[PDB]
Amino acid sequence: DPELRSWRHLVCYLCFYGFMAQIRPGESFITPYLLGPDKNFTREQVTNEITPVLSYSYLAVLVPVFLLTDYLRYTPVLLLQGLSFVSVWLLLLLGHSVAHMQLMELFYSVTMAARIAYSSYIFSLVRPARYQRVAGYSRAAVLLGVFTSSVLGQLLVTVGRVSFSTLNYISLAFLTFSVVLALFLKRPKRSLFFNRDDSVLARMLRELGDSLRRPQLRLWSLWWVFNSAGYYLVVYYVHILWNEVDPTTNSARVYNGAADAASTLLGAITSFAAGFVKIRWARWSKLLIAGVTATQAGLVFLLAHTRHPSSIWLCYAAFVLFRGSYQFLVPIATFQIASSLSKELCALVFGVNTFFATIVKTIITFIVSDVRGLGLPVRKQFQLYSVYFLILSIIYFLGAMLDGLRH
Numbered sequence: 317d318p319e320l321r322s323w324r325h326l327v328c329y330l331c332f333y334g335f336m337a338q339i340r341p342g343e344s345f346i347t348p349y350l351l352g353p354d355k356n357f358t359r360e361q362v363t364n365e366i367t368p369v370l371s372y373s374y375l376a377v378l379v380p381v382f383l384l385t386d387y388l389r390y391t392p393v394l395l396l397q398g399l400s401f402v403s404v405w406l407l408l409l410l411g412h413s414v415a416h417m418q419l420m421e422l423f424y425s426v427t428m429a430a431r432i433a434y435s436s437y438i439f440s441l442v443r444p445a446r447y448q449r450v451a452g453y454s455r456a457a458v459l460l461g462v463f464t465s466s467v468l469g470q471l472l473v474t475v476g477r478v479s480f481s482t483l484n485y486i487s488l489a490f491l492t493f494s495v496v497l498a499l500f501l502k503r504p505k506r507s508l509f510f511n512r513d514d515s516v517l518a519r520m521l522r523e524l525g526d527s528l529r530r531p532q533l534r535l536w537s538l539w540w541v542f543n544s545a546g547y548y549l550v551v552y553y554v555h556i557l558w559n560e561v562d563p564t565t566n567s568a569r570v571y572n573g574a575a576d577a578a579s580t581l582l583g584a585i586t587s588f589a590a591g592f593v594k595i596r597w598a599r600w601s602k603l604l605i606a607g608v609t610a611t612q613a614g615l616v617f618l619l620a621h622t623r624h625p626s627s628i629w630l631c632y633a634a635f636v637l638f639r640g641s642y643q644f645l646v647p648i649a650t651f652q653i654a655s656s657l658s659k660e661l662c663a664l665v666f667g668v669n670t671f672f673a674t675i676v677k678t679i680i681t682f683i684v685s686d687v688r689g690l691g692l693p694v695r696k697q698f699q700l701y702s703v704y705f706l707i708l709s710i711i712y713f714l715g716a717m718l719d720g721l722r723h
């Protein structure tokens with residue numbers, strides 16, 4: 317056992333690493349960079365040969381990372397997420413082939429699988445009497461870092477007048493700094509599943525079928541599997557659609573970072589406003605899902621049918637409201653699933669729901685989006701995503717009536 321770190325030097329460093337690990341100013345401007353005059357990629361190569369590999373590689377690495385997150389005690393995977401972000405921005409700046417960007421999506425899928433490597437790091441690092449204050453400060457440092465990277469990426473592009481290549485070298489400097497900050501993180505001695513000194517598995521399975529027959533876990537897991545698979549299929553491809561609506565030559569008029577900083581600012585407001593709604597609106601739960609999914613059905617339809625370049629701000633508003641609609645139902649889903657679950661059980665169910673949502677996301681993106689399937693453009697596949705939410709909101713509205721008139 318090593319020497320214990322100072323407490324104020326620990327929380328001010330977890331909230332500084334969790335702030336600096338989100339600083340990727342050129343993250344919202346990857347698609348205007350790939351579809352720009354610096355990359356030599358067709359519009360049909362980005363939406364049908366590169367971006368479906370993001371959902372393929374996410375399915376392949378979600379279970380290896382989630383096991384390696386708990387086996388390696390959450391410090392090498394926070395380093396793997398930092399080194400895969402450098403490998404994304406090294407393949408952005410030095411990659412020219414389509415296979416160089418399919419590899420880039422492979423490295424970005426490692427970082428998306430390691431998004432829980434920081435939320436579960438401070439869970440095992442901090443004692444439970446001190447955890448909810450540190451998890452409040454950390455989460456408010458993550459969503460401040462996600463906000464201020466899109467603001468810094470927008471101010472460098474619009475006000476600063478830098479190119480997308482220069483912005484990705486600025487983003488590469490903020491990402492090598494996040495690798496150095498991940499080296500000085502205190503590794504925990506025991507983990508939640510594998511490193512525990514002790515069975516854990518036996519207990520889990522035995523305490524699962526009791527919790528599997530809960531009408532709120534079984535309802536919101538089906539939301540997490542299907543209504544979140546269609547969510548991320550919009551977020552992957554909305555930057556390809558914004559490059560089609562307003563195909564500007566000047567990089568300073570792109571405003572992808574202002575539309576992803578506002579969706580983070582609205583995503584933090586609706587997630588805060590959901591915390592006073594998790595319990596008192598849990599009875600009218602299928603009607604809340606069917607009301608938001610039908611709202612997401614109209615916003616994705618509004619994205620797919622705005623064709624004039626002057627209505628690019630309507631496409632920016634129909635995605636800030638789309639991310640605000642989804643991030644409203646995430647604290648309600650996180651509460652109603654993990655209410656009567658253990659911490660080992662809630663880590664399993666949220667990992668299984670994210671895995672099953674990645675199977676649905678892979679099945680749709682192979683049929684609808686991939687060139688080996690249909691090979692649809694981003695407008696004709698956003699019309700299929702619009703009727704995907706409309707099919708889902710009708711199923712939840714029938715469930716809010718065929719289980720709502722039985723009283």
Ligand SMILES: CN1c2c(O)nc(N)nc2NC[C@@H]1CNc1ccc(C(=O)N[C@@H](CCC(=O)O)C(=O)O)cc1
Pocket residue numbers: 343344345346347350362366367370421424428462551552555580
């Ligand atoms: C970088 N960006 C991108 C892009 O713009 N264009 C292509 N072709 N490929 C890619 N690769 C990945 C990424 C677009 N795909 C994603 C994938 C995942 C997220 C994501 O984790 N969103 C989180 C919020 C975290 C955040 O704000 O980044 C959410 O819960 O909605 C957001 C966008």
